Design a protein around this nucleic acid. Structure first.
Ligand SMILES: [Mg+2]
Ligand SMILES: [Zn+2]
Lengths: 1111, 94, 263, 104, 142, 158, 83
DNA sequence: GGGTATTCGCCGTGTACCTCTCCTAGCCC
DNA sequence: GGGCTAGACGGCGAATACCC
RNA sequence: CGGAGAGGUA
């Protein structure tokens, strides 16, 4: 069909690679391919140069290299391995005394590798490292909260790379420095750093009134050595003030480039703010046995200047995006690697004293254990290493661009107030103001912008077009917020003639403040509105008509769409669907020009111009992490000529390269017999008839055979006391045959385990005697289908002990995995939603003849409630519906970009064009206007929707131009008393389906300690009767119901047993007893040497244990 | 709502007393196999199944209907419990 | 000391604390048996005091004792008693119960005010013992054991058991709940009506009391067993008898969006 | 009877020694190999009671005909296994120790 | 819930607590005011109240302010900030526990001055004011 | 009952009110630059003028609905009390109003567009502040409400 | 004396309610020293003990109501008159 | 000696449900 | 190869701090 | 069938 697109804003640059934030960062961190002689001092090389050389014999580092991965990616996914590469380092041990040089390449463990899309494979699972936002290191000046006219000067190094230094001007005049909750006069440290009274007097003399609080003769009397001793006594009380200890402590606290590490970004921020030049990344230096200042004097000067009110000195906002930075996967991995390397270094230092002091080879000195331990700890247990979310390609693409403020060295849920959750003025173009998790995590988790990129220092930059004079140039500049605050930035949609600004007065921003400006004062201009929002939000058409609170839910719900087997690209796109599919790497594109040689459901063989015959295998029916089925489908034919970049295979949830997460349905907006009450949704059975909204899901079960002291577990078709019907579908090896249908209760894998030695109860002895059957030495431990599940078996994976290439957990002989698939249709309970935040569960599925239908006989599919619009204020869906009606009658699709899209008059023109096709056709076949249409037209002209006096055709056209048509009721046949809005809407089927959530329990397992029923659907547990439910039951005054909820349906053991027996016998339930949890509480209180005694009305003891605990 | 719940609430001074009366009457009816009722054969609670009309197995409905009739006497300290139980089991064996 | 299904050992921290305490106590006994100098006995008694303190309340004084190779502080008796996860607020003022279920809710306009649509499978699972009794009464099964072995599998269910189930629930009620339960009307009693599908059908007018909408909400079903509980539910907790809010005294079961619009 | 009051009070060493069935004296918990409880450990069977209902540890008495009897070989009483949930032990400290609750 | 005399045995405390707590999530002073009222916390910007009866006499220094409650036998002086708004004009008789400055009243001082009934009435009215402003109908009974 | 994009009717008086407000703002700026009133008074009078214009345009919207479209779906939904309040109807048909900075201060320029006409990217970014503020407010209020309810329940349980 | 809801709840006489509420260690130590005896007056104590709460159908005002039909009452009256 | 004033340590901050992963390391017989 | 051993915020009450 | 961490729904 034809594709028509509106919009006049012409973008000068295309979107960057949407996943560059991960890929480029990791590639810079590893420096794998670059020759070792030219690697820059960043990442792994930086950690190596920092840790080495260690003195104590002096071990020196030369270079490193990365080996080849032992197994390909799919193989690791198969056998639960980690896709990693071996890291070798060429180290040489040098003997300082004699000169012994022992050089060799040592193996230092493995490093996980990043896939082509930007995710890792850890223990067979796909994982993602989320970038973290935090405060940039450097020097900051804040207003003193209590004392108004005073300021606090903070010096903050990299996280975990030093202590936070605080400087304050006390009321009595002395400048107090705070380190590790210890406050002391800064004058002592100033004296330690080699400063004299005259030096401070001449430097800070411009601001007298504080220098007098700075002058202290007692510290000026003693030399820096005694001052250092006193300082060490002040910091570490109780430690003997020996000179060497004080020197070492103060050095490691300030001058140590290994223990105290100011950031490169921190050094840059300091050089920019204080206007000085830093030779290194530490506050002071230990040179010639003394200490030399680098930072303290200029920052003290700046503080004393600011507190006096000199012009040019301003406080810093701690939420300004020039003061907050992003750590990418590279920096986090490098930090963990540095920690592991420091542990390895201290270990090596330990080995350099024990053992043979002469026979020492670097292979004997270094132990690879701490490095591997730290790296595996980071990749497995860290708070930022998250399970990948891959319900559909858009979901993973969004997850790769997520920004978290929590994690190590970050905020917690309790210490996050309103300030950190707000939207600062500098998020414009850098962080999406709309997309954020709803609930407790609101504002803490965010998403990168569209055009936003992260530089090498870690600040988020955004592009702007340069404007010189009145002409808008074409070269773009990427700027940060600190640099952005210095210019006047015009808007993107200003009128333009050629390259000249045509408007006399433009809307511009100055430091986030909106203002009206003359063109000559405009210095920069925006690139496009797209740069203000994330990737998810950029997919919602007609966003300028939706409230933020609802566009939020729309953006969030687009992630949870399920890939259908008949997906369709929407009728109203935003022009960004192709780029998302291309960058998600789901689809398969042609590398170069050529011709397709072979096309099959399994692979595609292409002949390029070079003559080489390339073969792309298609990932077919593969299970994602969330249980959805991802598969590729060939979209070409033998002999087809393809160019560079053409589509070859269509990925999951995509239709010819366009993102297709749902379907286009003909929806009418009206209330329908109360079935639309409060967000419910009525659908037609025609959707089910032609396999719409049909999705495929794959469930995976796993069973292990392990060695038991009573004998090994066996997988075998022979199971005691089972009829052949239960073993019909099993093969000889006890595994189900591929293709057999399994239902709840059926056996997937037969497994027998040796019967634990137990004495048969005399009742069971009597049964065995009367039946004459011997009890088998083995019992049934076969894996069965849980209740509510089932489907078709598609794959069986088997890994034994003694088979080559695989390794298991100690004690496990073999492991078997079974994959089960099922086609899930739409039904009462599933969740539907559109892109503008309207969501609801399917409440009724009507026959085709009951649905309202257009006069030409076509029935609508979905019915929405109009009462959802006025309180939600999301008018985008109404415009999308109008445009969809126009398209459905014209047979085309539209592309309306965000904030520069189809306005109302164009939609009216399109609707007139569509009405021509819709009406002249009927006119030609020999039909006028219906009687019911005439009645509806009369009732409408009584409402003021049409103009009186015109012919019925003109009034019908006037109604159509507003998106309203005459509908007939499928039940009665009479028309609805008024015109109704009807059009095509794009609706996606969400992932929360009722089939996965329905659950019930009569009786089942119980806990060990508390003897209460278990929890969760997995363990067949029961619901929780919480505290508030007890409050409600008390408020009703229902005493016996509550007593039963607490004892009979709970941890009262003999009570519930007698209750079950009496119920199956037909009598009423018995009277309960004391719950077991109270006995547990009493015994726990006795465990604390506290005697708890239950008494009667006469204060006599009452035994609730029935003499079981009384000697 | 329940049939005649208003007249039921009118009969007692506290709704909880009505609840207790109904529960105890239902327990009595269950224990004595419905052959100790005060209703008449034509006004017994009926239940429509696939076959036809039968006796409703729910004792609470029987108790509420009986209470609506008015042939029941309820209160405090009408008779010692053991004597009541003995006379009830003697008049209607199990 | 539980051997997990995977064959590994999971040990309560109480075991570790007791082991440490008994170790230090035996060490002190052995040292007293030999008569070491006063300093050794002194530091040993200090360690014993600290071990007893850690057993009774870990972390109350000094650094919390933790496992080697971990930062997680051990869980002493005091930490078991108190707290939101402690014994009191977790296992005494609230419990998990049998004969319960949970599902998604869907509007049903055809139900009366005192009815609720219940799926057939949830009803067959909740009312299982009464169903076994009824099946034993009629000729559906010889005894309760055969009835259970008949019901255990889904492909073995015939149609007579559905009539039996319809006979069982005649007149009984179930409690519907939705979390969070803010006021006493968050739990209400309804008569069940067996319907197809897997969702719970709810009456429209009671939607305001529960503060429930149909954008994916879930509800929990509980079943009262005895005649006392049945009377308490049918008389005081039935939805048709609670029309006025106890807070203000104004009606709660009142017309809403569609109804008010039409009228 | 009927529970009407709940009194709580301090526990003298006499009442503590009266609660216990024996002294724990070895830090072992269970044999890692056989999975049987270690002798005199935190999980001993002679102190806290049997593991299986009506069955001694050594396997001499295994029926309800013997209840309250103590097997001479293993030293275990033959009752219901539920007693393993109620019976308490006691450790005899070499020197007194202060209860932290009444100190901090 | 039934528009009739309450039945003996009803759990009234739980019903009152729920009826007060449920509309809490709709209060945009609001919820912090309700919380500080139910906890009887001394307010931050607290008003000043006359402990004794008498006639008001303002004394205004260009840098200081004071109020004198003058009876026939007794006299009391209260020092106030310069910007503190006044609710009493000179030459007026004010009751014990009457607010002089605009602001919230400390409940403990009101209890020491005017007695229990005044504190109870004031607390009831002040707690009801929030739910009134938020358009929530709630009976004073709870 | 249905909802079309033409069911949100823009009144004619909106243009006249906006022009009057613009000329009033110009007068205020001219009077400010002459040193008659300081910055605080100028800010306050601007806020006052914009609030008066907002209430006027709300009154105009509702009078137009009442007079010329007594059966308009939005007007019926508001009058019958089924859904919506006057403020949301104003935001749909009138003007969005004034939005406040994260610090609490109100912006000088208001959002003169409505959802029926469509916003501009700048005004949308402006309103996102209040949106996020309200969201965080609710998310942090729920827990305090729960704690208060529990304290009350436990103090009066007997 | 006037005190907030927190202190008023913690200063109650029943130590089970205060122990379940907050500051468990403090309340438990004070009650253990004082040798307190909980009388089970409130609702939380009876909920903990798993007993019948003294409200609604569990209240002592209506818990002891008897039900008997006319025939059985008449028979009992005749049996008592002949005793 | 007493009558405040600060501060320092402890306790506390919603309910219900679903999915997944992960639960010590080193050395020596 | 397994076994053994080693970047809140409030309130509340006691303890000084300090001033007269 | 015990605890931590993460994400999500209402
Ligand atoms: Mg909802
Ligand atoms: Zn034995």
């Amino acid at each position: 069909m034809e594709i028509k697109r509106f919009g006049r804003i012409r973008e000068v640059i295309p979107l960057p690679p949407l996943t560059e934030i991960q890929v480029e960062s990791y590639r810079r961190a590893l420096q794998a391919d670059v020759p070792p002689e030219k690697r820059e001092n960043v990442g792994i090389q930086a950690a190596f140069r920092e840790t080495f050389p260690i003195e104590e014999l002096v071990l020196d580092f030369l270079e490193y290299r990365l080996g080849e991965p032992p197994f390909p990616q799919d193989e690791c996914r198969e056998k639960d391995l980690t896709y990693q590469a071996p890291l070798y380092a060429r180290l040489q041990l040098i003997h300082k005394d004699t000169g012994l040089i022992k050089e060799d390449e040592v193996f230092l463990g493995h490093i996980p590798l990043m896939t082509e899309d930007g995710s890792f494979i850890i223990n067979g699972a796909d994982r993602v490292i989320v970038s973290q936002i935090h405060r940039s290191p450097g020097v900051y000046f804040t207003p003193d909260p209590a004392r108004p006219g005073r300021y606090i000067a903070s010096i903050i190094p990299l996280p975990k790379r030093g202590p936070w230094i605080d400087l304050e001007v006390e009321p009595n005049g002395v400048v107090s420095m705070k380190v590790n909750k210890r406050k002391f006069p800064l004058v002592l440290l100033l004296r330690v750093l080699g400063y004299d009274q005259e030096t401070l007097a001449r430097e800070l003399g411009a601001y007298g009134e504080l220098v007098q609080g700075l002058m202290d003769e007692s510290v000026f009397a003693m030399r820096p050595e005694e001052a250092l001793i006193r300082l060490f006594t002040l910091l570490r009380p109780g430690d003997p003030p020996k000179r060497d200890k004080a020197v070492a402590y103060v050095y490691g606290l300030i001058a140590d480039p290994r223990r105290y590490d100011l950031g490169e970004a921190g050094r840059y921020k300091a050089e920019e703010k204080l206007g000085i030049r830093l030779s290194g990344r530490t506050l002071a230096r230990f040179e010639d046995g003394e200490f030399k200042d680098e930072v303290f004097l200029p920052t003290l000067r700046y503080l004393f200047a600011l507190t006096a009110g000199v012009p040019g000195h301003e406080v810093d906002d701690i939420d300004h995006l020039g003061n907050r930075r992003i750590r990418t996967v590279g920096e986090l991995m490098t930090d963990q690697f540095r920690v592991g390397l420091a542990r390895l270094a201290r270990g090596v230092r330990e080995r350099m004293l024990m053992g043979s002091e002469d026979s020492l080879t670097p292979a004997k000195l270094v132990n690879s254990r701490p490095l591997e331990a730290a790296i595996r700890e980071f990749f497995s247990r860290s708070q930022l290493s998250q399970f990948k979310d891959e319900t559909n390609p858009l979901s993973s693409l969004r997850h790769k661009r997520r920004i978290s403020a929590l994690g190590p060295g970050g905020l917690t849920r309790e210490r996050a107030g309103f300030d950190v959750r707000d939207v600062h003025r500098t998020h414009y173009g850098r962080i999406c103001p709309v997309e954020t998790p709803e609930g407790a995590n609101i504002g803490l988790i965010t998403s990168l912008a569209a055009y936003a990129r992260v530089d090498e220092l870690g600040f988020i930059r955004t592009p702007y077009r340069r404007v010189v004079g009145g002409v808008v140039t074409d070269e773009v500049v990427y700027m940060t917020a600190t640099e952005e605050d210095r210019y006047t930035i015009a808007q993107a949609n200003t009128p333009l003639e050629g390259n000249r600004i045509a408007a006399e007065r433009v809307v511009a921003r100055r430091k986030g403040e909106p203002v009206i400006v003359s063109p000559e004062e405009v210095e920069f201009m925006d690139v496009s509105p797209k740069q203000v929002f994330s990737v998810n939000t950029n997919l919602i058409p007609f966003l300028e008509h939706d409230d933020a609170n609802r566009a939020l839910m729309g953006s969030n719900m687009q992630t949870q769409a399920v890939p259908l087997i008949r997906a369709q690209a929407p009728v109203v796109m935003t022009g960004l669907e192709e780029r998302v599919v291309r960058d998600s790497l789901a689809a398969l594109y042609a590398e170069e020009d050529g011709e397709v040689a072979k096309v099959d459901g399994n692979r595609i063989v292409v002949r390029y111009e070079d003559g080489r015959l390339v073969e792309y295998p298609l990932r077919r029916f593969y299970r994602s992490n969330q249980g959805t089925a991802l598969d590729q489908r060939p979209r070409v034919v033998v002999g087809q000529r393809v160019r560079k970049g053409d589509l070859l295979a269509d990925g999951p949830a995509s239709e010819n390269g366009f993102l297709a997460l749902g379907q286009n349905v003909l929806v009418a907006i009206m209330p329908f017999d109360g079935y639309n009450f409060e967000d419910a949704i009525v659908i037609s059975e025609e959707l089910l008839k032609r396999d719409f909204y049909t999705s495929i899901h794959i469930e995976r079960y796993e069973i292990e055979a392990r060695d038991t002291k009573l004998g090994p577990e066996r997988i075998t078709r022979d199971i005691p006391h089972l009829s052949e019907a239960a073993l019909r579908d099993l093969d000889e090896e006890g595994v189900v045959r591929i293709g057999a249908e399994v239902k709840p209760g059926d056996i997937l894998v037969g497994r027998t385990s040796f019967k634990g030695e137990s004495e048969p109860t005399p009742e069971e002895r009597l049964l065995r005697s009367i039946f004459g059957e011997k009890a088998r030495d083995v019992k049934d431990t076969s894996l069965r289908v849980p209740p509510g599940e089932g489907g078709i078996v598609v794959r069986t994976v088997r890994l034994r002990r003694g088979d080559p290439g695989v390794e298991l957990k100690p004690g496990v002989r073999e492991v078997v995995r079974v994959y089960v698939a099922q086609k899930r249709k739409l039904q009462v309970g599933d969740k539907l939603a559109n892109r503008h935040g309207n969501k609801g569960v399917v409440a009724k599925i009507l026959p085709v003849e009951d649905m309202p239908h257009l006069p030409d006989g076509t029935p609508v599919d979905v019915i929405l409630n109009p009462l959802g619009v006025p309180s939600r204020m999301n008018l985008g869906q109404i415009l999308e519906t109008h445009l969809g009606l126009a398209g459905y009658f014209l047979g085309q699709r539209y592309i309306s970009p965000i904030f520069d899209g189809a306005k109302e008059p164009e939609i009216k023109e399109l609707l007139a064009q569509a009405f021509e096709v819709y009406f002249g056709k009927r006119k030609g076949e020999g039909f006028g206007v219906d009687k019911r249409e005439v009645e509806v037209l009369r009732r409408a002209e009584k409402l003021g929707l049409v103009t009186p006096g015109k012919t019925p055709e003109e009034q019908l056209k006037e109604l159509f131009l507003q998106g309203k048509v005459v509908l007939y009721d499928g039940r009665t046949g009479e028309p609805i008393e008024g015109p109704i809005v009807v059009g095509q809407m794009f609706i996606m089927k969400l992932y929360h389906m009722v089939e996965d959530k329905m659950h019930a329990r009569s009786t089942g397992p119980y806990s060990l300690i508390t003897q209460q029923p278990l929890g969760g659907k997995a363990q067949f547990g029961g619901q929780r009767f919480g505290e508030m439910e007890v409050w409600a039951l008390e408020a009703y005054g229902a005493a016996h119901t509550l007593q039963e909820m607490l004892t009979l349906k709970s941890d009262d053991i003999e009570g519930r047993n007698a209750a079950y027996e009496a119920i199956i016998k037909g009598e009423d339930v018995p009277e309960p007893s004391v719950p077991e949890s109270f006995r547990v509480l009493v015994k726990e209180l006795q465990a604390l040497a506290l005697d708890v005694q239950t008494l009667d009305e006469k204060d006599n003891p009452v035994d609730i244990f029935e003499g079981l605990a009384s000697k | 709502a329940e049939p005649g719940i208003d007249k039921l609430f009118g009969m007692v001074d506290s709704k909880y007393r009505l609840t207790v009366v109904v529960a105890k009457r239902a327990q009595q009816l269950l224990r004595h196999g419905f052959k100790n009722t005060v209703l008449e054969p034509e006004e017994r609670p009926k239940m429509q199944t696939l076959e036809g009309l039968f006796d409703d197995p729910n004792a609470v409905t029987w108790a509420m209907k009986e209470l609506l009739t008015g042939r029941l006497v309820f209160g405090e300290n009408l008779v010692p419990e053991d004597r009541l139980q003995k006379e009830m089991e003697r008049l209607y064996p199990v | 000391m539980v051997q997990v299904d995977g064959g590994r050992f999971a040990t309560s921290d109480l075991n570790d604390l007791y082991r440490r305490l008994i170790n230090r106590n035996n060490r002190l006994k052995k040292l007293l048996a030999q008569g070491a100098p006063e300093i050794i006995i002194r530091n040993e008694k200090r360690m014993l005091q600290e071990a007893v303190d850690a057993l009774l309340d870990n972390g109350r004084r000094g650094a919390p004792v933790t496992n080697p190779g971990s930062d997680r502080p051990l869980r002493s008796l005091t930490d078991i008693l108190s707290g939101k996860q402690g014994r009191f607020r977790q296992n005494l003022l609230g419990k998990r119960v049998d004969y319960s279920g949970r599902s998604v809710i869907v509007v049903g306009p055809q139900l009366k005010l005192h009815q609720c649509g219940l799926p057939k499978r949830m009803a067959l699972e909740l009312f299982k013992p009464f169903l076994l009794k009824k099946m034993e009464e009629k000729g559906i099964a010889p005894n309760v054991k055969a009835a259970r072995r008949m019901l255990e599998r889904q492909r073995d269910i015939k149609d007579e058991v559905w009539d039996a189930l319809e006979e069982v629930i005649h007149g009984k009620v179930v409690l519907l709940n939705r979390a969070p339960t803010l006021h006493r009307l968050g739990i209400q009693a309804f008569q069940p009506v067996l319907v197809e599908g897997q969702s719970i059908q709810l009456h429209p007018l009671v939607c305001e009391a529960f503060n429930a909408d149909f954008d994916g909400d879930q509800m929990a079903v509980h079943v009262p067993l005895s005649s006392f509980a049945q009377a308490e539910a049918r008389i005081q907790m039935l939805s048709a008898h609670n029309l006025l809010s106890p807070a203000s005294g104004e009606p709660l079961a009142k017309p809403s969006r569609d109804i008010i619009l039409g009228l | 009877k009927e529970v009407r009051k709940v009194r709580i009070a301090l526990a003298s060493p006499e009442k503590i020694r009266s609660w216990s069935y024996g002294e724990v004296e070895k830090p072992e918990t269970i044999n890692y190999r056989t999975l049987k409880p270690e002798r005199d450990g935190l999980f001993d069977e002679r102190i806290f009671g049997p593991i299986k209902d009506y069955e001694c540890a050594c396997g001499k008495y295994k029926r309800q005909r013997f209840e309250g009897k103590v097997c001479e070989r293993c030293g275990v009483e033959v009752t219901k296994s539920i007693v393993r949930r109620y019976r308490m032990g006691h450790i005899e400290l070499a020197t007194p120790a202060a209860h932290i609750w009444f100190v901090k | 819930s039934m528009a009739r005399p309450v039945s003996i045995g009803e759990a009234v405390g739980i019903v009152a607590a729920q009826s007060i707590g449920e509309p809490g999530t709709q209060l945009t002073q609001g919820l912090p005011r309700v919380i500080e009222l139910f906890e009887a916390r001394r307010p931050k910007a607290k008003a000043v109240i006359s402990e004794i009866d008498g006639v008001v006499r303002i004394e205004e220094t260009e840098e200081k302010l004071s109020v004198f409650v003058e009876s026939e036998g007794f006299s009391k002086e209260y020092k106030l900030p310069k910007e503190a708004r006044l609710l009493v004009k000179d030459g007026d008789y004010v009751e014990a526990g009457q607010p002089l400055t605009r602001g919230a009243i400390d409940p403990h001082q009101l209890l020491e001055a005017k007695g229990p009934e005044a504190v109870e009435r004031y607390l009831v009215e002040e707690i009801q004011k929030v739910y009134r402003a938020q358009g929530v109908k709630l009976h004073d009974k709870h | 009952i249905t909802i079309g994009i033409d069911d949100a009717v823009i009144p004619e008086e909106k243009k006249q009110y906006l022009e009057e407000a613009d000329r009033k703002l110009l007068q205020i700026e001219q009077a400010y630059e002459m040193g008659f009133l300081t910055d605080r008074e100028r800010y306050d009078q601007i806020l006052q003028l914009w609030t008066e214009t907002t209430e006027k345009v709300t009154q105009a919207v509702f009078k137009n609905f009442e007079e010329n479209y007594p059966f308009n779906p939005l007007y019926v939904m508001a009058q019958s009390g089924a859904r919506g309040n006057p403020q949301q109807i104003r935001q749909l048909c009138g003007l969005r109003g004034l939005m406040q900075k994260p610090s609490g201060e109100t912006f000088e320029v208001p959002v003169r567009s409505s959802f029926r006409e469509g916003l501009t990217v700048l005004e949308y970014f402006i309103s996102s502040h209040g949106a996020r503020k309200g969201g965080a407010d609710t998310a942090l209020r729920t827990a305090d409400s729960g704690y208060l309810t529990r304290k009350l329940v436990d103090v009066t349980h007997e | 004396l006037l005190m907030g809801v927190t202190k008023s709840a913690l200063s109650t006489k029943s130590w089970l309610s205060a122990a379940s509420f907050q500051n468990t260690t403090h309340v438990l130590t004070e009650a253990a020293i004082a040798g307190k005896k909980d009388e089970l007056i409130g609702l939380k104590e009876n909920v903990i003990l798993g007993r019948l709460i003294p409200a609604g159908t569990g209240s002592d005002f209506v818990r002891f109501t008897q039900v008997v039909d006319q025939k059985t009452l008449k028979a009992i009256e005749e049996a008592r008159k002949e005793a």
